[PDB]
Amino acid sequence: MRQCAIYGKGGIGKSTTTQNLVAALAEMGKKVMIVGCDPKADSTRLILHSKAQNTIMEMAAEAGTVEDLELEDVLKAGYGGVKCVESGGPEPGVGCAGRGVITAINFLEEEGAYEDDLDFVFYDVGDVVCGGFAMPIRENKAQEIYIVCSGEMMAMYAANNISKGIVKYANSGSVRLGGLICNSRNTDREDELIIALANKLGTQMIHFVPRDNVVQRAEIRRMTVIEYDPKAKQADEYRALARKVVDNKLLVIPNPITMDELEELLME
Amino acid sequence: MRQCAIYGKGGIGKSTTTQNLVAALAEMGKKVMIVGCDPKADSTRLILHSKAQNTIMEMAAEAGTVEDLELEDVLKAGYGGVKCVESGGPEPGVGCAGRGVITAINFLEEEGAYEDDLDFVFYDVGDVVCGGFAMPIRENKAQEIYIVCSGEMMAMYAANNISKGIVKYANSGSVRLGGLICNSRNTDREDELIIALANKLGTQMIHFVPRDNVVQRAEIRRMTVIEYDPKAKQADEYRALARKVVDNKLLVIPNPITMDELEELLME
Amino acid sequence: SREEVESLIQEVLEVYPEKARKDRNKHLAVNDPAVTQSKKCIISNKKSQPGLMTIRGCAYAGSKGVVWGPIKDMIHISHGPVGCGQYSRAGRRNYYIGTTGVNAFVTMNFTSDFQEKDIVFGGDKKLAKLIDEVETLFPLNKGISVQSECPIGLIGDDIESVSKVKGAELSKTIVPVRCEGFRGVSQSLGHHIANDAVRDWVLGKRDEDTTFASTPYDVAIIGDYNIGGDAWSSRILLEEMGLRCVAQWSGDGSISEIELTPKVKLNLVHCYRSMNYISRHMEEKYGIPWMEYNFFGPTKTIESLRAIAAKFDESIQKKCEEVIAKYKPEWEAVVAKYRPRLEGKRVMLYIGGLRPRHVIGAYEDLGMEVVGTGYEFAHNDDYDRTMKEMGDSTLLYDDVTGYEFEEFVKRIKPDLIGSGIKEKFIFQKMGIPFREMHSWDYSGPYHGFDGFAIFARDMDMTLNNPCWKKLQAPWE
Amino acid sequence: SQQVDKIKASYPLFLDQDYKDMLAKKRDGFEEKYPQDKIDEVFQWTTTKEYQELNFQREALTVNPAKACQPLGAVLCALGFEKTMPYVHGSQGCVAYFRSYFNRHFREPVSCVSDSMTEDAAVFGGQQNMKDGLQNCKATYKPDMIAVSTTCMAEVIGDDLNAFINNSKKEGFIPDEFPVPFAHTPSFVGSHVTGWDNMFEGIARYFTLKSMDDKVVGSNKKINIVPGFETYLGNFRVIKRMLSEMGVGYSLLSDPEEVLDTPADGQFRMYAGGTTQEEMKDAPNALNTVLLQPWHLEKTKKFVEGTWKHEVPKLNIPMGLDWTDEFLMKVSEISGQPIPASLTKERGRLVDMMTDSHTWLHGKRFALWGDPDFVMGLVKFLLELGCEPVHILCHNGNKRWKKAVDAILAASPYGKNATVYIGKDLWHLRSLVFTDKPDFMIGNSYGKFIQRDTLHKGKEFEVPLIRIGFPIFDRHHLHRSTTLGYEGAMQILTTLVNSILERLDEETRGMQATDYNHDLVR
């Protein structure tokens, strides 16, 4: 059972890209779980169908202590028998969400959530701001990491900045960058652009994802594109991303680049 | 001396919109300061001309303790006599940046960085993830907040999500929402969609900012659009945003909308 | 013993990997009786090297431990998790009068007892309900000092605001004191944070209130945490010299007593490391001169008894002499009784930021020459007061570590040593007489005249006790 | 004043009229203290039933705990493994407290180190100090092992101890083969007892998880003994004595005894005794593992039963009479060795003291508190002796626990008059001894104040404090006694009967008043 952690610069496309990838994975008859390590609590909203259900941290607040919670309360079945859970967290400007992520993953691990025959466990991590948000990539958490990026100067600065922090957990641990996933700038010189960075990093660009508004038609209609419009152009695209991932065996240790070489790229 | 914080969803346009606004504010012969409350450390890079200078938390580590630092080491003059300081921060997955924001802000205040002769102190705050990132809006910090947004479902969910976390510091304190700043995300109804949400919120749409590529030219070249191409179309736009801000008197207490009224908007 | 300490020091440091090696080598240097800066001789107040057995504390030990804890008519809330609070309950021996639980709350421990969720969701909301429960369950509480802990510092909670709201609401003074452990290099910051914390929320509230009468003698004892009664053992002399002791800061202190410091004629400071900061704001804002004194032993107290006198009129001076004459026979009696037993016995010390230099005089009188000292959180300006009180070619340490200290003790071979609880055992095992200095080893007052008496007797019961001769078994 | 040949210390000195005068002038002069009238009033108030409900309705403030944080319970666990170094990742003042605290109780040296995480640490994470700290400490105090712990500071900033450790290895600071177990020890979670679990289990893994493939259940035919957070050396010793006099093979995983009791003979010993790694390494080859205090070793059991595949016994803490025969019987069931006639005698000798002392102990109502295993233990034995365990408080206890204790009380009639209390602090018990007054209290030194407060009310209301548990600072060398099994039960009993006998001698020693009941023999 592989567990992969999906990272990226907030607002480039982690959750959709994920829920859709697992939605596709679910289509392939796979036992998957989506751990939502983001205070926003939308990591599962597209597979379960709603704003969001009762989260771990929010729930554990009710019982007084997290140790009082039961995996039955947070873990819920959604589309294609995909299991979901949310790490929960505070509100803008109060508390430590980096903690919830920890509390939540510990709980899942602790309550033997990795107990049933799961084939894939996807951690949809938000911003990699501090120590807690690195939780997914220790030992026993996720081994494969799929950084999301785009053709923007800052979207890559991140993909770069992210993989940089990974080398700490990657050297000492076993977690590794499996590849970048691109959610484009329309394909206008980007189809190959990211591939450049993927190399200077030492990883591959697993798959390129289009800017198809079918994602908004699904997003606003509270579902994935794979359930929403099964044959839409980007429905297969997401099926591709899913298929490539499954067969992907390229897991490397990231080689960060410098601002200078970074900007050098775009510059050319 | 007014102090405004600028918030928004990672990846919509805080730093450029801020630096350009103060760039324009400098053009107007104003004494302005930019406090970089973000770990990435690019809040000043366009006004100062490089990747980034020596930050507070990074510098203070050299002196062993923050109490050993001198405002002279972090504060550097930039374009149009604009002062710039960075809070500093750890790398992805390690440490606590929400703390740097604090240590860095307390420092500037401690070392009398305000007991200067400024007219505008802009706080470029990154993700509002936890408590320390709420620093720029207590008592004695910022009183005006300008949430940046775009015509995307997820960009508004944040503009709304942000103002929600504001009402907490707004009710108990004096901070208020001055108005939304639309930095183009290319929709069709960018003009009205936002204005609409601006009303359901109880604020105004201070200004609308074009999707001009002069900013990639400025961005990749290591500078603002105001110093790069002074007469470029969007150079006056950013001047507009700055001017409107200066004269702006509208500071209200937000009134979040619900998912249902939200999606109702777009659907309209 | 001239080049010795150097062949001793770099031999001890010899074990230290190069990172720590260079560093420590500068914290311990030979003392020349005449240099007036330690920036050439030794360094202090820097970060402690990892994994080394330090005794240094944190900013918390300084604000809730030394400074606030002591205010008997207030309720100091340990804000943060459970450990801290329950590790310092009655640890310090700063004595006081009153009805604990009813009127006073010092040997007591109030904590917000942070749980998993408090940390996640952050908690000022818990702090407000908690500032509420005290007012109801502890009516006679006269203010609340909220001592923060590490978590509060990271989670970034506005404990500063709440204290304004609840308090401005409950009509009671609340001190949003920030003493996060991760702050500072030692406990020191806690002091500086405390001092200021005082001048902000407590000190300046009786500013336009003159229902008080400043007598040309009114004073306040600042920096006497009254460990064991030292504050009373000193408040007695001043008053018997005619001065009017108005305030005592931390050590049976009253929140109000702290509030009357501004209207005094002179601030007497025994702890130049803890209340030195405040004693300046005390003078630049209010304009109230302050001085440093020492009440350890006859010759120090006697001397000081006169310094604090000259700052007044001759009237008090002749009165002062009467006090000195009174105790002259008593302390003389002590020396003639004990000095014979302590004579020539040398002693080795290691304390915080005052006693390290301040006890030597109390020793000179007993004839126990001091051949080594050190501080765990002092600054150069604290060593600047030391070099003189010391002999030449004496070894000094700063933030000394187990290996560092233990090796000096093993080589210099002292008859008596004085440090804290963490160290009291390691040497008692080496058959070296140890006498706690921090807690006075639960003994009586040492400051002043009556105090000196017990001291001179406490060194004797321990140093010359029979136990020591019984360490190595006969058959060996 | 002080006279040379009769030096008055802290208490006689301030009693002198000269000093009393002083304090009065301070009080009436600058304290702005309330008049005794209302002070007495507010007191009179707190000591009531009205105040109690207010007290218990409490939900945010805590007054005088009965627990400590986790890192403290970790350090003690570590002290147990031979030549290891309690290493705490985080602040330095924490360990400075952890140490100072363990001193006052055992009153011997307490070695433990810390990576002094300064302000920058919180802001940039704590990598170097962990890296260097492991090197410096390992270089200076020369351990064989270092078990990393963590203060609040690392938990929030979520430093990955694991990664942090391994980098230092690869980065070349410490021999890659150097044993360095670890365990996140969130002081803001559970309690000190919990730290002991996390810390222990951590180690139980470091030496087994990887090597599980070649170990056979019961290869050395021995019995593992996991103590848990235990501070009475007498208990470590007594448990070893019994198994040992049974001819039972065993291994005490986590054994402080030598190290916390190093003879003062001139040579300082930073380490002594302890459980060998080679011993912890071989653990799985035993017949079965025994957990003396399951209620705070719940994470250990999960591992032992899970990874080692040990059929862990459902035993309670070996306290009192019944829970001891059960402990021994089960050991007899496993080791193969029978219960020695030796131990059987001991038992009968204990039952002898019971029949012999039963009169005085019968019906004595007590109030008590401590750790979950202790209280559950003590309470039990109290029913055996025939005393009413009126108020039972356990500040760090839980629901599953509480209701296991209630049931133990449901069995005997001497237990039908007692209530359990979890998540309730000392200040709550101050009330319970006032509204429904005991005879005595059985706790730590912290119960010295609940005692005082009862006296101020009225001598006929004072509740004497019998010190059993942890801490015990106001007394000397109690740390050497035993509270487990027969041996440690002979003591508990004597300590009460004579605790009672003493009071009766004090209550009744008034000449021509109460001295008539001053029986020479009892």
Ligand SMILES: Nc1ncnc2c1ncn2[C@@H]1O[C@H](COP(=O)(O)OP(=O)(O)OP(=O)(O)O)[C@@H](O)[C@H]1O
């Ligand atoms: N294929 C796509 N083309 C264009 N826009 C897309 C596509 N997929 C997703 N989006 C848009 O991206 C926005 C954010 O997507 P998503 O919810 O995945 O965010 P995210 O950045 O991963 O969130 P977080 O960082 O908070 O986990 C939504 O407005 C969504 O419609």
Ligand SMILES: Nc1ncnc2c1ncn2[C@@H]1O[C@H](COP(=O)(O)OP(=O)(O)OP(=O)(O)O)[C@@H](O)[C@H]1O
């Ligand atoms: N309307 C616009 N005008 C100028 N640049 C734009 C616009 N829309 C998008 N961009 C480009 O997108 C990127 C986002 O700009 P910026 O540097 O402000 O980042 P950001 O995501 O707002 O920063 P942060 O999230 O760290 O606060 C830049 O590359 C910018 O030039």
Ligand code: CFM
């Ligand atoms: S170790 Fe005093 S600067 Fe401070 S608790 Fe003791 S040598 Fe402190 S004199 Fe004082 S009353 Fe003390 S003895 Fe300055 S207050 S942080 Mo440990």
Ligand code: CLF
């Ligand atoms: S420096 Fe958290 S409960 Fe408190 S002892 Fe800690 S592990 Fe335990 Fe100083 S302010 Fe307090 S003692 Fe900061 S945390 Fe230590």
Ligand code: SF4
């Ligand atoms: S930056 Fe991270 S570790 Fe720090 S308070 Fe915020 S969420 Fe927590």
Ligand SMILES: [Ca+2]
């Ligand atoms: Ca001892």
Ligand SMILES: [Mg+2]
């Ligand atoms: Mg998402």
Ligand SMILES: [Mg+2]
């Ligand atoms: Mg920015």
